[PDB]
Amino acid sequence: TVKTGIAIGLNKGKKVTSMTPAPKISYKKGAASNRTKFVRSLVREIAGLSPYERRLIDLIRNSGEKRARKVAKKRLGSFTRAKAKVEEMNNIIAASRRH
Amino acid sequence: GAYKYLEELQRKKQSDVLRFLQRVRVWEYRQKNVIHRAARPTRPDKARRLGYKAKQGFVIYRVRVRRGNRKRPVPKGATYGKPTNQGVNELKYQRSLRATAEERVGRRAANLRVLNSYWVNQDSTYKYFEVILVDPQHKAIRRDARYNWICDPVHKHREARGLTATGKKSRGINKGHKFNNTKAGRRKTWKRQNTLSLWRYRK
Amino acid sequence: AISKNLPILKNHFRKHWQERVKVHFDQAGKKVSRRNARATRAAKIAPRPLDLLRPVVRAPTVKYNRKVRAGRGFTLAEVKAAGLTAAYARTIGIAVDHRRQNRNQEIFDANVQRLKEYQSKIIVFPRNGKAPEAEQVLSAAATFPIAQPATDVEARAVQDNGESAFRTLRLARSEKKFRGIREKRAREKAEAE
Amino acid sequence: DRNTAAETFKLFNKYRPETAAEKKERLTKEAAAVAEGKSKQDASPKPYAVKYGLNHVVALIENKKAKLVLIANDVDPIELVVFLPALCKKMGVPYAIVKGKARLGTLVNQKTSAVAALTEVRAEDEAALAKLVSTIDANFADKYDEVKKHWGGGILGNKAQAKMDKRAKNSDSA
RNA sequence: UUGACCUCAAAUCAGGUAGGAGUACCCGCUGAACUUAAGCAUAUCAAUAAGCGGAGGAAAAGAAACCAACCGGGAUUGCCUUAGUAACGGCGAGUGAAGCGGCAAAAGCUCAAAUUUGAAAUCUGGUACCUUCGGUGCCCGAGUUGUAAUUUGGAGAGGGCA
RNA sequence: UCUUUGUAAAGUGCCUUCGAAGAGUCGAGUUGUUUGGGAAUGCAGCUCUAAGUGGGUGGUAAAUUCCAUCUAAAGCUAAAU
RNA sequence: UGACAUUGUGAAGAGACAUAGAGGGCUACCUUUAUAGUUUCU
């Protein structure tokens, strides 16, 4: 991570003595907590899925993951959200099959 | 700790329970008055998050506003204007349905101050909001410095001046490069960068 | 219209600029008002140095990389290494900045030294004392100036080894430009047996 | 049903909280005690009261402290307690949907409680509480999966029932 | 034969509050055209005038879902500058910011989301007393569908040392 | 000035566990308006509509071996203007 | 006029995705069978 000590190149910049400052707590925002995981599991167990997720599950089972990703991209925002949603539906069907 | 459960459940807008509740509650609100007093918030967690506290001087008002575009309120067709301004139908109001909801609520309850508002329901014709208001003259708010800031005259009709959350969002009041036109105020910025500044010794 | 050989000038005066004309007639009066406000605030805070102690920081970009200037406040790490809590530093006149980090040991030492100097050079009156005033000074900035760190000696020994420092720049630029293509070639050669 | 509701509310009424007059009496007696003997504020016995408050009781269920939890059915926003049977099933605390948030409010000396809970009991009625919990669990905690599969509603008005009755009668009358 | 809750009412009920004025400046909505383009329709004028709503002595903004790409700065706001520039534009007429840099001024923070559960510890009002911008007895009420203390991301949360 | 409501509120040289953080909201599309913001700067209407090492941004539209930087959808705040 | 939303609950026929059997001397649009990812109107 050290700079090369010249003005042009891949790690250009002055060669200084780094410090790696103490991480801020605000950088811990994406971290899952036991409280929120417990609440979310209980809430999903008491609420249940939505029509587009039901369609996604049946699409994964019958048509396939590529078509599921296409429809999830259409429903949700983007490809990253579609990927996360289709993988989540894969988790759901895995849990359903196991028990 | 039921508020966490309430909020997580509310996020699941498309579940069977929430669809059923949405149907029945939207019918009930449609059958009630356009602006009416709500005895309690239907989303206590949302109200507390937005600043409502279950104490005397805090009130909740339910309001519904018509959805859709803002049709230009002038036929006669006689604008003698340019084709760029000729459009009538697909024009959009620059303030949110939330903003007009709380403006109507504040005009109705002009003795209170609009603290906040949130979305509760919607159908094709209407959107439904609940407005949290505070009484600046109740002593339970005038004392107890946690909320007496709103009893100062500078907060008269925050909903009208666009100082609520929806108002600031619509005004564009945000930090960053994407809001260079609207950070300190659109018109203030325009005036500052269209002023001709002349010093005694001309620079 | 357009006429003889002249530069093309863009005088943006097609709006109602005459309404938005701000000629600064109040420059002298406002300087007097600013000095009066400074004096009045000094009289109000009569023992205090009229401003907070600021840290030394580096200017961000590559154009001002060389300069060292005055920042907003000291890092929580800096005030900890000096030996104070953030709240007490704020209360005895040290500007504290939470969001600024120190990834740099040199700047860390410079600001810790500034904090130690300030602590040595100030006196905190007790809450129940005789208030031994000490002829208040008016500028922590003027009594703790920012000095540019000395990077090198005036004379040294020539250490030449034969790379000309231009071939080095050219090669470093070349590796930066072609690294992705080289990684491509390496990955393709590993993939195709 | 009414009988077990009566037994449960009798047990809870025996476990009813302390009134304001009793609270003032207790505070004055503790003031006298710490004045004369300088007691460590523990001369008063440990209280045995029914825990109320939705957040308090939900936290108690989360902590598994609650022996038994009564959930009203009249809460105007159902989402306040609609997750409570699931929480009680998850944490293995017996729950009973009871009739009357006003009844629970009278139980806890208010107008409306929407939830009540016992976390600790006295030995003199621990057996009664266990007997009550057996039947309450028989109704609610073990039939939870069936109750979560069972769909309600869908009942039509009197005239509509009569109309479908007439149609079915004239259809199967051949 | 009775007592509650929920919601919704009524009263010349107890006490309050809102409206209107002014509007130079301030916060928004709405919104043109004359004009320029040597015509003209996009553009320009102009995110202006007129119209509407809402404040104060200032308002607004404000302690980063920022700027950056550096050896990194560090709430906001103004001035100098960036700069008539990067960009936009029948790429025509025209329009057109921002980071850095210097300075003025500088100030920080708090709610929701946590069980006080060995004690709603909170608060309006009525009635008494007094040192009355209020403070103390008592009473009713609000409030557990959550009022106090505790923590606000910089952090912060059943304990123990010199 | 009458006096401290004599168990009144604050830090590390060692952490037994953690660390709740805002949803018709981000985000996507489309429409209109607006911006210097240009495969779309902000705003608004409609449709869809999330997630937890997640989410936003990184000024050219689209999987990533890695980055960097903040922490939104709640709120108050004098001075320089 | 279409699509989507408002918008929630049940019924016969028309297109592919026959893995196969009815036709005319290295072979035409071609009526028709299991209908367990699908269709809107009469």
PDB file of N, CA, C and O in Angstrom, chain B residues 52-93:
ATOM      1  N   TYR B  52     -43.039  12.188  16.859  1.00  0.00           N
ATOM      2  CA  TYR B  52     -44.226  12.194  17.699  1.00  0.00           C
ATOM      3  C   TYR B  52     -43.920  11.562  19.050  1.00  0.00           C
ATOM      4  O   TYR B  52     -43.188  10.573  19.144  1.00  0.00           O
ATOM      5  N   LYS B  53     -44.470  12.156  20.103  1.00  0.00           N
ATOM      6  CA  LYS B  53     -44.393  11.608  21.447  1.00  0.00           C
ATOM      7  C   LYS B  53     -45.800  11.560  22.019  1.00  0.00           C
ATOM      8  O   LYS B  53     -46.573  12.509  21.864  1.00  0.00           O
ATOM      9  N   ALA B  54     -46.136  10.448  22.673  1.00  0.00           N
ATOM     10  CA  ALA B  54     -47.500  10.218  23.147  1.00  0.00           C
ATOM     11  C   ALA B  54     -47.732  10.997  24.442  1.00  0.00           C
ATOM     12  O   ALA B  54     -47.852  10.446  25.538  1.00  0.00           O
ATOM     13  N   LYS B  55     -47.804  12.317  24.291  1.00  0.00           N
ATOM     14  CA  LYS B  55     -48.059  13.203  25.414  1.00  0.00           C
ATOM     15  C   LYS B  55     -48.955  14.339  24.949  1.00  0.00           C
ATOM     16  O   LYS B  55     -49.063  14.621  23.752  1.00  0.00           O
ATOM     17  N   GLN B  56     -49.606  14.983  25.914  1.00  0.00           N
ATOM     18  CA  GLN B  56     -50.541  16.055  25.605  1.00  0.00           C
ATOM     19  C   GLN B  56     -49.838  17.192  24.876  1.00  0.00           C
ATOM     20  O   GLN B  56     -48.726  17.591  25.233  1.00  0.00           O
ATOM     21  N   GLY B  57     -50.499  17.715  23.849  1.00  0.00           N
ATOM     22  CA  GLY B  57     -49.920  18.684  22.955  1.00  0.00           C
ATOM     23  C   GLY B  57     -49.487  18.117  21.621  1.00  0.00           C
ATOM     24  O   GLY B  57     -49.250  18.885  20.686  1.00  0.00           O
ATOM     25  N   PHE B  58     -49.377  16.798  21.510  1.00  0.00           N
ATOM     26  CA  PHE B  58     -49.092  16.137  20.245  1.00  0.00           C
ATOM     27  C   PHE B  58     -50.395  15.617  19.660  1.00  0.00           C
ATOM     28  O   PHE B  58     -51.165  14.944  20.354  1.00  0.00           O
ATOM     29  N   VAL B  59     -50.653  15.940  18.392  1.00  0.00           N
ATOM     30  CA  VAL B  59     -51.878  15.517  17.730  1.00  0.00           C
ATOM     31  C   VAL B  59     -51.533  14.883  16.390  1.00  0.00           C
ATOM     32  O   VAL B  59     -50.468  15.121  15.812  1.00  0.00           O
ATOM     33  N   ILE B  60     -52.461  14.063  15.900  1.00  0.00           N
ATOM     34  CA  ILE B  60     -52.326  13.370  14.625  1.00  0.00           C
ATOM     35  C   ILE B  60     -53.557  13.674  13.783  1.00  0.00           C
ATOM     36  O   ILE B  60     -54.691  13.566  14.265  1.00  0.00           O
ATOM     37  N   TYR B  61     -53.338  14.042  12.524  1.00  0.00           N
ATOM     38  CA  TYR B  61     -54.429  14.345  11.607  1.00  0.00           C
ATOM     39  C   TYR B  61     -54.278  13.514  10.343  1.00  0.00           C
ATOM     40  O   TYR B  61     -53.198  13.472   9.753  1.00  0.00           O
ATOM     41  N   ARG B  62     -55.356  12.864   9.922  1.00  0.00           N
ATOM     42  CA  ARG B  62     -55.350  12.076   8.701  1.00  0.00           C
ATOM     43  C   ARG B  62     -55.878  12.913   7.545  1.00  0.00           C
ATOM     44  O   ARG B  62     -56.855  13.654   7.694  1.00  0.00           O
ATOM     45  N   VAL B  63     -55.226  12.792   6.391  1.00  0.00           N
ATOM     46  CA  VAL B  63     -55.534  13.626   5.236  1.00  0.00           C
ATOM     47  C   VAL B  63     -55.339  12.796   3.975  1.00  0.00           C
ATOM     48  O   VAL B  63     -54.459  11.935   3.915  1.00  0.00           O
ATOM     49  N   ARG B  64     -56.183  13.031   2.975  1.00  0.00           N
ATOM     50  CA  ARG B  64     -55.993  12.415   1.668  1.00  0.00           C
ATOM     51  C   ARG B  64     -55.956  13.479   0.579  1.00  0.00           C
ATOM     52  O   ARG B  64     -56.724  14.444   0.609  1.00  0.00           O
ATOM     53  N   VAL B  65     -55.048  13.290  -0.375  1.00  0.00           N
ATOM     54  CA  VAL B  65     -54.844  14.221  -1.480  1.00  0.00           C
ATOM     55  C   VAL B  65     -54.999  13.472  -2.794  1.00  0.00           C
ATOM     56  O   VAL B  65     -54.583  12.314  -2.916  1.00  0.00           O
ATOM     57  N   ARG B  66     -55.593  14.140  -3.778  1.00  0.00           N
ATOM     58  CA  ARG B  66     -55.792  13.531  -5.084  1.00  0.00           C
ATOM     59  C   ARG B  66     -54.458  13.298  -5.780  1.00  0.00           C
ATOM     60  O   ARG B  66     -53.571  14.155  -5.770  1.00  0.00           O
ATOM     61  N   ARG B  67     -54.327  12.129  -6.393  1.00  0.00           N
ATOM     62  CA  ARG B  67     -53.110  11.719  -7.070  1.00  0.00           C
ATOM     63  C   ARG B  67     -53.097  12.211  -8.510  1.00  0.00           C
ATOM     64  O   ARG B  67     -54.127  12.572  -9.082  1.00  0.00           O
ATOM     65  N   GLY B  68     -51.912  12.210  -9.095  1.00  0.00           N
ATOM     66  CA  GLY B  68     -51.748  12.505 -10.501  1.00  0.00           C
ATOM     67  C   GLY B  68     -51.050  13.829 -10.739  1.00  0.00           C
ATOM     68  O   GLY B  68     -50.535  14.480  -9.825  1.00  0.00           O
ATOM     69  N   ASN B  69     -51.051  14.227 -12.008  1.00  0.00           N
ATOM     70  CA  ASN B  69     -50.352  15.419 -12.450  1.00  0.00           C
ATOM     71  C   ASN B  69     -51.100  16.677 -12.025  1.00  0.00           C
ATOM     72  O   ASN B  69     -52.218  16.635 -11.502  1.00  0.00           O
ATOM     73  N   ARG B  70     -50.461  17.815 -12.267  1.00  0.00           N
ATOM     74  CA  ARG B  70     -51.060  19.125 -12.051  1.00  0.00           C
ATOM     75  C   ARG B  70     -51.415  19.699 -13.417  1.00  0.00           C
ATOM     76  O   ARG B  70     -50.556  20.234 -14.121  1.00  0.00           O
ATOM     77  N   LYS B  71     -52.683  19.574 -13.795  1.00  0.00           N
ATOM     78  CA  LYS B  71     -53.139  20.158 -15.045  1.00  0.00           C
ATOM     79  C   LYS B  71     -53.047  21.676 -14.972  1.00  0.00           C
ATOM     80  O   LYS B  71     -53.384  22.287 -13.954  1.00  0.00           O
ATOM     81  N   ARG B  72     -52.572  22.280 -16.051  1.00  0.00           N
ATOM     82  CA  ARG B  72     -52.450  23.730 -16.107  1.00  0.00           C
ATOM     83  C   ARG B  72     -53.841  24.336 -16.002  1.00  0.00           C
ATOM     84  O   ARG B  72     -54.693  24.053 -16.855  1.00  0.00           O
ATOM     85  N   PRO B  73     -54.126  25.168 -14.991  1.00  0.00           N
ATOM     86  CA  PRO B  73     -55.508  25.564 -14.696  1.00  0.00           C
ATOM     87  C   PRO B  73     -56.001  26.725 -15.553  1.00  0.00           C
ATOM     88  O   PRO B  73     -56.730  27.604 -15.082  1.00  0.00           O
ATOM     89  N   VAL B  74     -55.649  26.709 -16.835  1.00  0.00           N
ATOM     90  CA  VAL B  74     -56.087  27.741 -17.773  1.00  0.00           C
ATOM     91  C   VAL B  74     -56.315  27.158 -19.164  1.00  0.00           C
ATOM     92  O   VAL B  74     -55.361  26.870 -19.902  1.00  0.00           O
ATOM     93  N   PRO B  75     -57.558  26.917 -19.528  1.00  0.00           N
ATOM     94  CA  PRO B  75     -57.959  27.012 -20.926  1.00  0.00           C
ATOM     95  C   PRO B  75     -58.257  28.467 -21.218  1.00  0.00           C
ATOM     96  O   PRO B  75     -57.791  29.351 -20.490  1.00  0.00           O
ATOM     97  N   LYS B  76     -59.046  28.697 -22.266  1.00  0.00           N
ATOM     98  CA  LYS B  76     -59.119  29.872 -23.125  1.00  0.00           C
ATOM     99  C   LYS B  76     -58.067  29.718 -24.204  1.00  0.00           C
ATOM    100  O   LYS B  76     -58.102  30.418 -25.220  1.00  0.00           O
ATOM    101  N   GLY B  77     -57.140  28.784 -23.999  1.00  0.00           N
ATOM    102  CA  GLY B  77     -56.117  28.457 -24.971  1.00  0.00           C
ATOM    103  C   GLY B  77     -55.308  29.662 -25.406  1.00  0.00           C
ATOM    104  O   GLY B  77     -54.372  29.536 -26.199  1.00  0.00           O
ATOM    105  N   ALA B  78     -55.634  30.826 -24.851  1.00  0.00           N
ATOM    106  CA  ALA B  78     -55.165  32.117 -25.340  1.00  0.00           C
ATOM    107  C   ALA B  78     -54.005  32.547 -24.459  1.00  0.00           C
ATOM    108  O   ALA B  78     -54.113  33.510 -23.695  1.00  0.00           O
ATOM    109  N   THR B  79     -52.899  31.816 -24.558  1.00  0.00           N
ATOM    110  CA  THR B  79     -51.658  32.218 -23.926  1.00  0.00           C
ATOM    111  C   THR B  79     -50.854  33.181 -24.779  1.00  0.00           C
ATOM    112  O   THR B  79     -49.994  33.883 -24.241  1.00  0.00           O
ATOM    113  N   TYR B  80     -51.115  33.223 -26.088  1.00  0.00           N
ATOM    114  CA  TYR B  80     -50.232  33.861 -27.063  1.00  0.00           C
ATOM    115  C   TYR B  80     -48.774  33.499 -26.784  1.00  0.00           C
ATOM    116  O   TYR B  80     -47.851  34.278 -27.032  1.00  0.00           O
ATOM    117  N   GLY B  81     -48.572  32.292 -26.260  1.00  0.00           N
ATOM    118  CA  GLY B  81     -47.264  31.876 -25.806  1.00  0.00           C
ATOM    119  C   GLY B  81     -46.558  30.977 -26.791  1.00  0.00           C
ATOM    120  O   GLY B  81     -47.085  30.694 -27.870  1.00  0.00           O
ATOM    121  N   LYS B  82     -45.379  30.523 -26.434  1.00  0.00           N
ATOM    122  CA  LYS B  82     -44.602  29.680 -27.325  1.00  0.00           C
ATOM    123  C   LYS B  82     -45.012  28.214 -27.205  1.00  0.00           C
ATOM    124  O   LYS B  82     -45.548  27.785 -26.171  1.00  0.00           O
ATOM    125  N   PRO B  83     -44.762  27.438 -28.263  1.00  0.00           N
ATOM    126  CA  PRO B  83     -45.050  25.997 -28.205  1.00  0.00           C
ATOM    127  C   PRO B  83     -44.333  25.275 -27.079  1.00  0.00           C
ATOM    128  O   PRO B  83     -44.805  24.215 -26.649  1.00  0.00           O
ATOM    129  N   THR B  84     -43.206  25.800 -26.593  1.00  0.00           N
ATOM    130  CA  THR B  84     -42.532  25.175 -25.458  1.00  0.00           C
ATOM    131  C   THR B  84     -43.385  25.253 -24.197  1.00  0.00           C
ATOM    132  O   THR B  84     -43.375  24.329 -23.378  1.00  0.00           O
ATOM    133  N   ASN B  85     -44.124  26.346 -24.021  1.00  0.00           N
ATOM    134  CA  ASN B  85     -45.023  26.520 -22.887  1.00  0.00           C
ATOM    135  C   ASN B  85     -46.444  26.076 -23.195  1.00  0.00           C
ATOM    136  O   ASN B  85     -47.299  26.116 -22.305  1.00  0.00           O
ATOM    137  N   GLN B  86     -46.713  25.659 -24.432  1.00  0.00           N
ATOM    138  CA  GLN B  86     -48.066  25.291 -24.833  1.00  0.00           C
ATOM    139  C   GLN B  86     -48.608  24.072 -24.085  1.00  0.00           C
ATOM    140  O   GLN B  86     -49.826  23.868 -24.061  1.00  0.00           O
ATOM    141  N   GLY B  87     -47.745  23.271 -23.462  1.00  0.00           N
ATOM    142  CA  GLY B  87     -48.198  22.032 -22.850  1.00  0.00           C
ATOM    143  C   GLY B  87     -49.118  22.253 -21.664  1.00  0.00           C
ATOM    144  O   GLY B  87     -48.990  23.220 -20.912  1.00  0.00           O
ATOM    145  N   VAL B  88     -50.068  21.332 -21.496  1.00  0.00           N
ATOM    146  CA  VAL B  88     -51.084  21.439 -20.453  1.00  0.00           C
ATOM    147  C   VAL B  88     -51.128  20.193 -19.572  1.00  0.00           C
ATOM    148  O   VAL B  88     -51.203  20.293 -18.342  1.00  0.00           O
ATOM    149  N   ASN B  89     -51.082  19.013 -20.191  1.00  0.00           N
ATOM    150  CA  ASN B  89     -51.567  17.809 -19.521  1.00  0.00           C
ATOM    151  C   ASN B  89     -50.501  17.138 -18.658  1.00  0.00           C
ATOM    152  O   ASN B  89     -50.731  16.870 -17.474  1.00  0.00           O
ATOM    153  N   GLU B  90     -49.327  16.857 -19.224  1.00  0.00           N
ATOM    154  CA  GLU B  90     -48.324  16.055 -18.533  1.00  0.00           C
ATOM    155  C   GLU B  90     -47.399  16.887 -17.657  1.00  0.00           C
ATOM    156  O   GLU B  90     -46.257  16.483 -17.407  1.00  0.00           O
ATOM    157  N   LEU B  91     -47.861  18.036 -17.179  1.00  0.00           N
ATOM    158  CA  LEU B  91     -47.073  18.861 -16.278  1.00  0.00           C
ATOM    159  C   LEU B  91     -47.183  18.344 -14.851  1.00  0.00           C
ATOM    160  O   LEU B  91     -48.236  17.857 -14.432  1.00  0.00           O
ATOM    161  N   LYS B  92     -46.090  18.458 -14.103  1.00  0.00           N
ATOM    162  CA  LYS B  92     -45.982  17.877 -12.773  1.00  0.00           C
ATOM    163  C   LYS B  92     -45.759  18.968 -11.736  1.00  0.00           C
ATOM    164  O   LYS B  92     -44.890  19.829 -11.908  1.00  0.00           O
ATOM    165  N   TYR B  93     -46.546  18.920 -10.664  1.00  0.00           N
ATOM    166  CA  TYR B  93     -46.348  19.808  -9.527  1.00  0.00           C
ATOM    167  C   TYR B  93     -44.974  19.574  -8.913  1.00  0.00           C
ATOM    168  O   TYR B  93     -44.506  18.438  -8.820  1.00  0.00           O
TER     169      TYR B  93
END
